[PDB]
Design a protein around this ligand. Structure first.
Ligand SMILES: *[C@@H]1O[C@H](CO)[C@@H](O[C@@H]2O[C@H](CO)[C@@H](O[C@@H]3O[C@H](CO)[C@@H](O)[C@H](O)[C@@H]3O)[C@H](O)[C@H]2NC(C)=O)[C@H](O)[C@H]1NC(C)=O
Ligand SMILES: *[C@@H]1O[C@H](CO)[C@@H](O)[C@H](O)[C@H]1NC(C)=O
Ligand SMILES: *[C@@H]1O[C@H](CO)[C@@H](O)[C@H](O)[C@H]1NC(C)=O
Ligand SMILES: *[C@@H]1O[C@H](CO)[C@@H](O)[C@H](O)[C@H]1NC(C)=O
Ligand SMILES: *[C@@H]1O[C@H](CO)[C@@H](O)[C@H](O)[C@H]1NC(C)=O
Length: 1377
């Protein structure tokens, strides 16, 4: 009965058959569920269900009956099925099939509905007698993201099927059995089924907003009554309303959805009931008022993760983790409590801290490091104080001078290499001369003959003659001979003068092979380099025992730690830890290790892989119950307990050497439980045989006095291959992402490898690996666990590993730190302190719940509107517990909620009267008749959405006008999910920086140019607009491919995860594709793209003009603007539009404008980056679109573009603007008119702020401008605009009209070519005499009148009507066509 508004969203691809959708949703990533269901439908079991409802009904009985899902998992299935999560996954198959399969399968297809692909041969029959073709193109056997494999088999078989028909069932069974036997491995790919219709897909999981566009007024429903500004209590009274109700959850939803309407309805019926000013005892301890914060089992979630898709994926990952834990008899409540424990979080913070290695000469008896300094005895520093209090009493970024030993830097240098030598001579010495408070040492590198000799030479020269003489040889050699090889012509000259009085033990001269000097010194040096792995292609520098690889600007890194170490000393001083007679460098060396392993302590800190241990012994029970196992001792303690697994190729020396060390390590440590997995490179001979050889010797293991006893044990015995073992073996490696013939080590779930050489991992290396690992992962689990009194649940080394391995996996973020939020992955328990009686309410059983949600919502917030709606639907799930906290603010200067909100989402699917799946819509009932509203879509981050069907103005909605024009009080609008984003964050390799100005191309097998974009400075950001399918990213041919080669697109994560050295992107989700690509510079380049060492016209048009309109009037005026151009030029024109701000009425009309006026048009858009600062006010968004994304909004093929405002009219042939010389400037603008005489008062750009800032420069107009795009990108102007905007935008009153203000604020930095004023006319600021020579007219605002825009046009321009008539009759001609 009430006046309503209905909004629906539909995808850009047709709806896949429901059957296949349920298969995919059902078996998320468990393959067994997939094929176990694929059997069921190949019976013809699902043939008897006629309707989607019945079909859906059937799946529930099946899953429950076959043991696939429990209540918790079934409930999760329904929600994910509502969300239609599996539909893009299915469309991936189709797009792949349409674009790579069909054009590479030459011949005549008839009867080949289904067909296996074997050895590039197609078989249309199960009986497999005849093969139709040799398939053209690249291999289809590449395993890609949407693939599934069933069984292990040498041969690989693929079936492209249309499951829908009965023709499928026999084909399946042929290969299911073939895989069951073990002949080959089975996988299914899809074929678009023509039994189904081409109807588009109706989506859900988004939000709709109705924004009040007039907020100025403040002192069933007609209009909101504006109430006297007693805003301050809204949050507080609003919070009480709910608490009082006692059906609280529903109140908040009902209140929060229509909140603007209920503002004046609050403060009534002795309203405050402020018992809860009590709970700011809650505020006093933890969070600030009016802040929204969500936690999921301690995990603090960012806003972007708080959508239905983001949340479904989190539960899925979390339950897998918890279920693993609760097979050891822990309640969901106990499990979570252990995960978020204080001792656990402390450990993460603990090894976020730096680990140091002992850089001293002590082991090598002081004969390896050749220092250029001594700060306690150098008579340069003599002037300085040797006092501790010099350190402690410091502030700033300046280096404190001191005569003390406190900071050291040891840099290993190769004396053959010029660049290396140059470091010492220029780099190291300047620092000395400069009186820096750092001691500088260097140790030569000995990887070649010449290097060995030159270390000897320099070492000798130091020993007898001294530092200066040695220094001297080095300096002279660098300039003089310019090579590593020793030069006597250079050497002898040095001794000639520098050989005066070589003290102590005498010089021997001429030739060196001192038994001691060559042996001891060089081999001691080698022992130092080897010990700390300070050599290779990339050497390692040690500052205060902290490894810094010799790359990029390592001194920048050193300076960072130098200040960070100083602050570490200061704090010990204020606690009085320090004293005057102390060796300060040993404050750092307290916990330092003598030996450094790059595997255990990788210098890429992120590099860490942990596996779920319970999973490993559950999935591969067949394998792990038949591996040689050394049980850890009967009589050893819980603290001693640890579990180790060695994966090695026993057909290689390195593989068997590695195991000997592991066995040795086991003899010493009684607490460890060892497992041996034989992973061979060549699988011609069964892996089961060598495993069977050892399990017989299992009892006798580690009784190998010598290595050959192990070697011999491998050779002897006759065995029968357990081919069941072999199958589980190759499944394990596939699950664990391990290659064949690769060596790996696993202690308590953590993987290190591949081990190329067994010398890398020795007995001593296992000991530290256990020592370190023990500390972090095991000791925080043990304490925490015991604190809760769950320490009864640990029954052995394997029992313990399950827990420790699970809790290590809990703290690994999905999102790399520094991108979406800087904050680390630390699970807080800090809200448990909070009193709950009067602000909290809980939903779901805590006793049974596996999922625990903690929401802190401010009722007055607009963000809260979304949060409540989503959380209500996730609360409906069984096995989920939710607890809500309401926290309003007293600080309300402006109206808090200025919109109505509806979230389109259901917890379980809805069905038709005819049993089809119900589409979901946002229906607003009882909308005020007199309020002007704006329709907005609050869509998940990866989505790009535009209006498709609407007859109304969504920018200016009013029921009274629609009623008086259309006769209906009911509004319906349909949107289209046109694109889904592929977005990523780039980095250069190895010295990781964002490559800006790099150009990229997206491609498909059908077309080599889907899309193109350029790399941004901020986070090496880039994006593409695409739909489900298989794509590839190639650097654009030109300068980009000249300078770089991209090793990878980061599709597996930040990584590098092995197996990701790929450039293939696929999108099979509503979350799009997130990528972290890597690019390494080609041989010796410090080059830059941005600086140099008829195309666009042909592709597009003579003239390229772009614009935006945000109303029916402005779109009507835009039609006139385009026409005026056309009449005024005998040239070719192409028009460009900002797609999402335009009406469907306008969108449906243009082809008709294009046919009549003879122009070309193209729709463009870009999605506002997540890092870039948003605009809550739509008009401001629009302005941002014209200036912020100029370089990335238009294809690279476009040389230049021109912006013309919608209200404008042009009498000029527009080419002239193209030909206008810009004098090497990126863009050109026209200034403000000075010509009108008496207008001055309203000329605000002659005031203090604008005249002080614009010293001599003009105040420009954003109605018309030229962008020399090629130059724009070349100058990388965009990046500067974007970062200045982001920086300025922190202040809300910063840019009145950003579009005009940003180019004006940046004209110092970025040149603006100024235009002849023949180019702009405006009555308000230009004289009437001026318009004779006027080229174009903007209709700028009155403001000494109130005459409106429609009036100015008719009065100001007589030919405006002529243009309007032309459009008017055509629109009617179309309507009557
Ligand atoms: C992937 O799906 C399969 C099949 O649905 C899951 O396997 C099933 O796991 C259950 C345990 O949840 C097995 O039941 C029993 O487990 C106990 C464990 O102690 C064991 O002692 C019993 O003998 C029995 O196996 C069940 O047999 C097994 N298969 C089926 C058809 O139910 C598997 O857990 C799923 N994987 C993931 C990642 O969840
Ligand atoms: C209702 O509020 C008024 C004003 O604060 C107060 O005088 C009155 O006592 C309240 N009613 C009750 C039942 O306490
Ligand atoms: C929680 O309430 C109790 C009882 O009034 C009080 O003693 C305690 O301090 C409160 N906690 C906080 C942090 O306000
Ligand atoms: C304190 O002074 C003593 C005495 O000279 C010295 O041996 C030591 O380095 C200092 N610190 C401690 C912990 O004794
Ligand atoms: C278009 O072409 C005609 C014929 O050559 C010419 O007379 C006319 O002036 C041209 N239009 C304009 C405005 O340049």
């Amino acid at each position: 009965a009430s006046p309503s508004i209905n909004v629906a969203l539909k995808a850009a691809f047709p709806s896949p058959p429901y059957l296949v959708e349920l298969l995919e949703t059902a078996a998320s990533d468990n393959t067994t569920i997939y094929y176990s269901l694929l059997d069921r439908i190949a019976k013809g079991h699902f043939a008897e269900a006629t309707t989607d409802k019945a079909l859906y009904e059937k799946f529930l009985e099946v899953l429950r009956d076959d043991g696939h899902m429990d209540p918790e998992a079934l409930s999760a299935f329904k929600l994910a099925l509502s969300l239609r999560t599996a539909t893009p996954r299915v469309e991936a198959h189709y797009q792949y099939y349409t674009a790579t399969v069909e054009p590479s399968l030459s011949g005549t297809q008839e009867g080949c509905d289904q067909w296996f692909l074997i050895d590039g041969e197609q078989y249309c029959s199960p009986t497999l007698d005849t093969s139709h073709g040799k398939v053209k193109g690249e291999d289809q056997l590449r395993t890609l993201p949407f693939d599934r494999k069933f069984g292990v088999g040498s041969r690989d078989v693929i079936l492209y099927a249309d499951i829908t028909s009965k023709s499928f069932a026999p084909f399946h069974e042929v290969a299911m059995d073939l895989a069951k036997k073990g002949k080959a491995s089975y996988r299914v790919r899809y074929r678009r089924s023509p039994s189904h219709s081409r109807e588009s897909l109706s989506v859900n999981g988004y939000g709709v907003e109705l924004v009040l566009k007039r907020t100025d007024y403040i002192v069933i429903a007609d209009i909101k009554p504006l109430e006297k500004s007693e805003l301050a209590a809204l949050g507080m009274k609003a919070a009480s309303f709910v608490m009082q109700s006692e059906k609280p959850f529903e109140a908040l939803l009902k209140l929060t959805q229509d909140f603007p309407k209920y503002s004046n309805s609050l403060g009534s019926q002795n309203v405050s009931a402020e018992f809860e000013a009590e709970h700011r005892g809650n505020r006093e301890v933890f969070l600030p008022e009016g802040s929204n914060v969500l936690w999921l089992n301690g995990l603090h979630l960012i806003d972007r993760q708080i959508q239905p898709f983001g949340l479904v994926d989190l539960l899925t990952r979390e339950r897998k983790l918890i279920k693993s834990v609760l097979d050891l008899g822990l309640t969901g409540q106990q499990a979570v409590d252990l995960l978020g424990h204080a001792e656990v979080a402390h450990a993460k913070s603990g090894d976020d801290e730096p680990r140091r290695f002992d850089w001293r000469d002590d082991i090598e008896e002081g004969q390896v490091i050749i220092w250029l300094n001594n700060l306690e005895k150098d008579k340069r520093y003599k002037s300085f104080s040797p006092s501790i209090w010099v350190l402690i009493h410091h502030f700033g970024h300046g280096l404190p001078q001191i005569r003390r030993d406190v900071f050291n830097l040891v840099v290993p240098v190769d004396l053959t290499k010029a660049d290396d030598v140059k470091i010492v001579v220029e780099g190291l010495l300047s620092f000395v001369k400069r009186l820096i408070p750092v001691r500088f040492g260097f140790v030569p590198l000995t990887p070649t003959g010449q290097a060995i000799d030159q270390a000897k030479v320099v070492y000798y020269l130091l020993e007898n003659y001294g530092l200066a003489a040695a220094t001297a040889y080095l300096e002279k050699s660098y300039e003089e001979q310019s090579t590593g090889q020793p030069n006597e012509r250079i050497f002898n000259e040095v001794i000639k003068d520098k050989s005066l009085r070589p003290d102590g033990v005498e010089l021997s001269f001429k030739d060196i092979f001192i038994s001691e000097k060559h042996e001891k010194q060089i081999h001691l040096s080698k022992h130092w380099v080897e010990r700390l792995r300070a050599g290779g292609d990339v050497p390692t520098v040690f500052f205060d025992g902290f490894p810094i690889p010799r790359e990029c600007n390592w001194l920048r890194v050193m300076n960072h730690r130098l200040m960070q170490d100083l602050q570490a000393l200061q704090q010990a001083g204020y606690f009085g830890m320090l004293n005057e007679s102390m060796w300060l460098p040993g404050f750092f060396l307290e916990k330092a290790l003598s030996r450094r392993n790059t595997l255990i302590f990788p210098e890429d800190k992120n590099e860490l892989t942990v596996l779920n241990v319970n999973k490993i012994y559950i999935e591969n029970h067949d394998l792990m119950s038949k591996v040689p196992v050394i049980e850890a001792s009967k009589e050893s303690t819980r603290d001693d307990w640890a579990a180790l697994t060695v994966v090695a190729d026993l057909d290689d020396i390195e593989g068997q050497e590695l195991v000997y060390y592991a066995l040795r390590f086991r003899k010493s440590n009684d607490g460890v439980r060892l497992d041996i997995v034989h992973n061979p490179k060549d699988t011609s001979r069964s892996p089961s045989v060598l495993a069977q050889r050892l399990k017989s010797r299992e009892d006798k293991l580690l009784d190998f006095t010598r290595f050959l006893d192990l070697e011999t044990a491998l050779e002897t015995g006759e065995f029968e291959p357990d081919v069941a073992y072999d199958a589980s073996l190759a499944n394990f490696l596939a699950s664990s992402n391990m290659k064949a013939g690769d060596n790996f080590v696993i202690l308590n779930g953590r993987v290190l490898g591949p081990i190329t050489s067994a010398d890398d991992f020795k007995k001593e290396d296992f000991e530290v690996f256990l020592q370190a690992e023990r500390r972090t992962r095991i000791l925080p689990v043990y304490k925490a666990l015991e604190d809760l009194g769950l320490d009864d649940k640990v029954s052995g080394p394997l029992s313990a590993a399950k827990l420790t391995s699970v809790t290590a996996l809990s703290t690994i973020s999905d999102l790399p730190q520094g991108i979406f939020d800087n904050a680390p992955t630390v699970r807080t328990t800090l809200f448990k302190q909070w009193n709950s009686t009067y602000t909290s309410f809980e939903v779901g059983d805590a006793s049974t719940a596996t999922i625990f949600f903690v929401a802190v919502i401010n009722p007055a917030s607009e963000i809260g509107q979304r949060w409540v709606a989503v959380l209500k639907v996730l609360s409906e799930l069984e096995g989920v517990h939710l607890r809500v906290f309401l926290n309003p603010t007293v600080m309300i200067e402006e109206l808090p909620v200025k919109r109505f909100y509806r979230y389109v989402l259901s917890s379980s699917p809805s069905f038709d009267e005819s049993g089809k799946v119900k589409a979901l819509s946002a229906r607003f009932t009882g909308v005020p008749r007199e309020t002007l509203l704006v329709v907005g879509m609050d869509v998940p981050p990866a989505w790009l959405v535009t209006s498709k069907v609407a007859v109304d103005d969504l920018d200016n909605l009013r029921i009274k006008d629609i009623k008086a024009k259309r006769g209906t009080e009911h509004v319906e609008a349909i949107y289209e999910l046109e694109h889904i984003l592929i977005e990523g964050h780039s980095r250069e390799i190895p010295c990781a920086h964002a490559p800006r100005g790099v150009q990229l191309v997206l491609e498909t097998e059908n077309n080599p140019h889907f899309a193109d974009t350029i790399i941004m400075a901020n986070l090496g950001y880039f994006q593409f607009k695409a739909n489900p399918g298989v794509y590839n990213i190639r650097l654009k041919e030109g300068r980009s491919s000249e300078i770089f080669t991209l090793e990878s697109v980061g599709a597996k994560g930040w990584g590098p995860i092995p197996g990701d050295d790929n450039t293939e992107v696929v999108l099979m989700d509503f979350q799009g594709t997130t990528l972290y690509p890597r690019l390494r510079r080609k041989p010796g380049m410090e080059e830059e793209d941005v600086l140099e060492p008829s195309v666009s016209k042909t592709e597009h048009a003579e003239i390229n003009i772009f614009s935006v309109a945000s109303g029916h009037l402005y779109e009507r005026m835009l039609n006139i603007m385009m026409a005026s151009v056309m009449h005024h030029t005998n040239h070719t024109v192409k028009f460009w539009f900002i797609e999402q701000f335009l009406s469907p009425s306008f969108k449906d009309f243009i082809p008709h404008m294009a046919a009549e006026y003879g122009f070309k048009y193209e729709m463009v858009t870009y999605k506002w980056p997540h890092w870039l600062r948003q605009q809550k006010e739509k008009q401001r968004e629009i302005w941002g679109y014209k200036i912020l994304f100029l370089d990335v909004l238009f294809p690279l093929s476009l040389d230049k573009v021109i912006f013309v405002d919608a209200d404008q009219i042009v009498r000029t042939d527009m080419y002239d603007l193209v030909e206008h010389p810009l004098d090497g400037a990126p863009y050109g603008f026209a200034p403000m008119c000075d010509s009108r005489v008496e207008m001055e008062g309203y000329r605000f750009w002659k005031t203090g702020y604008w005249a002080n800032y614009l010293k001599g420069k003009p105040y420009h107009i954003s109605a018309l401008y030229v962008v020399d795009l090629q130059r724009f990108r070349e100058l990388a102007a965009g990046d500067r605009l974007r970062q200045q905007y982001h920086a300025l935008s922190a202040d809300p009153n910063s840019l009145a009209n950003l579009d005009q203000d940003l180019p004006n604020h940046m004209q110092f930095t970025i040149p603006i070519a100024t235009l002849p004023q023949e180019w702009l006319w405006c009555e308000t600021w230009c004289s009437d005499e001026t318009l004779k020579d006027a080229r174009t007219i903007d209709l700028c605002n009155n403001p000494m009148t109130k005459e409106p825009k429609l009036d100015r046009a008719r009065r100001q321009v007589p030919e405006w009507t002529k243009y309007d008539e032309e459009i008017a009759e055509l629109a009617r001609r179309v309507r009557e066509e």
